[PDB]
Symmetry: D2
Subunit: 311 residues, 4 copies
């Protein structure tokens, strides 16, 4: 059976980490499982330092195991998954998993989610598909996956392009793979980084204040992601503040608060005139992930736009 490493970032999702094989004994029939506690935080407190720790650990320990499962809180799992999708260089499956119900609650979803995550990490067909999220019997790619509902066990969906495969009786039928470049096909190399460029997110809505945007600019933030209205549009005072900042060198990415679809180039904002970048199907928190990593390579809006077109 394959050697699978479980990297935990918080509390247990079934039934500490070295006792998962006794909480889910059926794991022993599909893998030899070894567990390590990397951090212990709630995922609402996820941060850049944990991201760097996780990427470096996977890239360092790749040769010591056949696949990785990362147990993670659901709140920010979609952000961590995409960060690792862009920075992991390991050739072996990396699978993120969580639980929408507490492990001690009735009909807890964690045990079977963990089982199916280990199935996915052990499947030779899972390799070269990027970093994966496995939730509710489904294999999802780290780029498009997002939390769609605040409480449903079925909350995680790839809302623009769909799942990669479904799991039944411990077997996966993969019918899709992400076309955007991931893992060893990206230039992002965080092995020597102690920190990431500073990128914040501002919301747009009727009568929106420019004060949040101005505060990030005044703090010297390297980039700002706009959660715009509709197809990435901005309330006038927010636009004005971000347009001035882009002329001073702040990177500005237009995303959307709208939960599906793409913030497109060639719409109602002349991005080239203002020095802005359109996020495509990346939602604001995912756009932040790629913008931070883009800013490790370049500050030029045309080159950042090309990054947002390839990854």
């Amino acid at each position: 059976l394959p050697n699978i490493t479980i990297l935990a970032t918080g509390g247990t999702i079934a039934g500490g980490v070295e006792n998962l094989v006794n909480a889910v004994p059926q794991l022993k029939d599909i893998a030899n499982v070894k567990g390590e506690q990397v951090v212990n935080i709630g995922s609402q407190d996820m941060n850049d330092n944990v991201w760097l720790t996780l990427a470096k650990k996977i890239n360092t320990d790749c040769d010591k195991t056949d696949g990785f499962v990362i147990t993670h809180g659901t709140d920010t799992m979609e952000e961590t998954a995409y960060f690792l999708d862009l920075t992991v260089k390991c050739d072996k499956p990396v699978v993120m998993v969580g639980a929408m119900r507490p492990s001690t609650s009735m009909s807890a979803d964690g045990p079977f989610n963990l089982y199916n995550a280990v199935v996915t990490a052990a499947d030779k067909a899972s390799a070269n598909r990027g970093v994966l999220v496995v939730m509710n019997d489904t294999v999802l790619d780290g780029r498009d996956v997002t939390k769609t509902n605040t409480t449903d066990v079925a909350t995680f969906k790839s809302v623009n392009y769909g799942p990669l495969g479904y799991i039944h009786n411990g077997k996966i039928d993969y019918q899709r793979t992400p076309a955007r470049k991931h893992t060893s096909d990206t230039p992002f190399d965080v092995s020597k980084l102690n920190e990431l460029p500073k990128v914040g997110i501002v919301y747009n809505y009727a009568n929106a204040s420019d004060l949040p945007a101005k505060a990030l600019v005044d703090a010297g933030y390297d980039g700002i992601v706009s959660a715009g209205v509709g197809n990435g549009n901005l309330y006038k005072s927010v636009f004005d503040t971000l347009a001035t900042a882009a002329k001073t060198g702040t990177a500005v990415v237009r995303s959307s608060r709208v939960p599906t679809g793409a913030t497109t180039q060639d719409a109602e904002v002349d991005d080239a005139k203002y020095g802005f970048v359109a996020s495509g199907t990346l939602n604001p928190q995912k756009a932040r992930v790629l913008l931070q990593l883009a800013l490790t390579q370049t500050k030029d809006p045309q080159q950042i736009q090309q990054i947002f077109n390839q990854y």
Copy 2:
């Protein structure tokens, strides 16, 4: 035929039929752009304001509510043409502040009126059908898009470009439109229009309420900037079931005990931010938004703050409207 007033807030959502007859109009041309409006209503148009909906603001909201409430006895129903980007916010504001019980229907277009297969003309026709239907009364303010009647509280823009973008993502639509007929199977249970206490006829401004986003390694600077500006309320677009990044939590905990109303909503597009989850709202003086997303929670918080600053009373408001 019913008298229907169209209130325009921006550009035309339907064009055509405007060839001149003299050798030598705007909203008044809609009866020529969509000539079959004649079959279903007596239409009169007024241009209230002309702005893109990404620049929607409190002043336009107050103008619309006051106009509808003042002109209720002069017409049988209202249609408001509005940009799609913030329609869901205006719809809910009017849902809470309109006291006319005659139908008020909002409508827009996801394709330009000059484009191939423009959706505006048929959307406008169906909006007038809805405003003319006696069965549409007493259901609150409505949004009519893509052959569907949606209630103003739950309706939201779900896709950046699709003509089918507007959905009531938690509780579903009220009715579907086919061949100019509506089969209504639902009505909102939350209190609306004349069953709310919100009365803005005499108000010239609304309490200041801003929105902050949560994500990994979120800065507290947006929240701090609102607090420094003396904002009356702050809505948090939380992660998951309304949770907060530690730095943002710290600032909002301070703000809630120092005279700021704090509502926990969620960046997650469906589902409720609940009480009795993983944030002790009673300890911190916070309010949970329920199924109201951040921009909709801002609407209700602004209006709540015209009545009260007490967090327990604001929570009751968020449990009733």
Copy 3:
């Protein structure tokens, strides 16, 4: 605490808590498999029948309706445990024939009770919560699955394996359940339970109604076989908005003028099969099903045929229930 009766129609959807105490139950063990039922209700269980729901039939339907109507005054609410494959059919049959106004809630499980992360226990808990809630009365027969309360008319199985499969795909759910509390925001407008004329207490059989599928190059032999057997009604699972393959159309046109009731439904999983579309129903004597899918249209057609054979009166029934 309310008295809640559980009527089981098959295997247990929750297990455990059954260790013996003597050195030397089935549905009666559910209070041990889900011990927190004690916190919310006084539960008594009866095994009505024991079958897989793919073998559901008219006799079980009649038994359930009669039992609920007979035992209504002996309890405060009912929960029916049922297989998922045909739950949506039984739910609608009971929605039309139950005359008790106390809550009747159906519940099932998409994972075996012995499996990892089995959904049955929490589904049953939430079903009892719903049946015990005074607010659940007068909303018709309900289905409670995956923390959601769904009305029996619109609820359908949308996925072959997902625990979240049951959805009200046209008009949405009535309420969501969190921490043992329901926030109801909707109720069905179509007439149900004591507002219908359908009374099956004295009936030992139901009219014969079959379903035929439409597709490219569809054979007329299924339809002809029903007609030859003297079926009282035939439901067509049409293509698109209720359309029929030419050979099937020919047979059903003949059947409708020769004493068979013919209802046009659709294999398409959401939306209505409408009147005034591309099938002249008046000319052919057909009835359009609206949002009722084929198996749900069969339920209403069977019951319509206990009252009338007249296609105009059956159409009115399909417009009211």
Copy 4:
């Protein structure tokens, strides 16, 4: 500009076929369009003879054009699309398109759907993705696409695995391609066939009659697809009739009336014992398509099951 052939099977969807460039003049700016009327029927009357005509025409005329657009009624478009997905051997885009509103109705969707279908057929990136359906600004694969709503212009969706790309301003961002084998990677060759094996569909529901199933068996049908309940289950009397028929050599495929998900092997029916085949994510009408073509190659249930696992 590319040469695009429009093959019409019914009435016009914009504004006969030789006049589409004047109904949608913007087509002239993206392609040189030539139109042919192959048949003129409503798609509710679609049939095997039209399917054979279309496949042979595309395979014969492949060298004479750069891509194909087929105008088709929406009712059975998902069946024709999958038939062609399995039988077209041409290396050039084949794109199906229709309209949910009449061409003479307000806000008719046909004109822009046709424009976007020609965009897709002209895009070099559309090749080698199988037969496509283009509806409501979206490119969908012929296998998974299905009509989800009776009237909505947005009705067509790939409900299990998602779309291949979205179209904005005449440009497509493809992020997916079907993994199941299609077009020139299948063995199905209809170039010399005058007819297809007889395959019918029976519905399952409470108290279901076995008489439809028995009628198809008595007519000597080569195959029967069951629209089962849940995960492909059958009402007892239908099961019994189909089990007896399978022992006599009738091919029997279990599908489901449930609109998403897979009728799986290793569930509540012992397919190997009874000689049945599980359809996977193919719905009943799509399962019929593949079963008919399977039966041109083999009558053995294990070999038919392998076909349903590869195509």
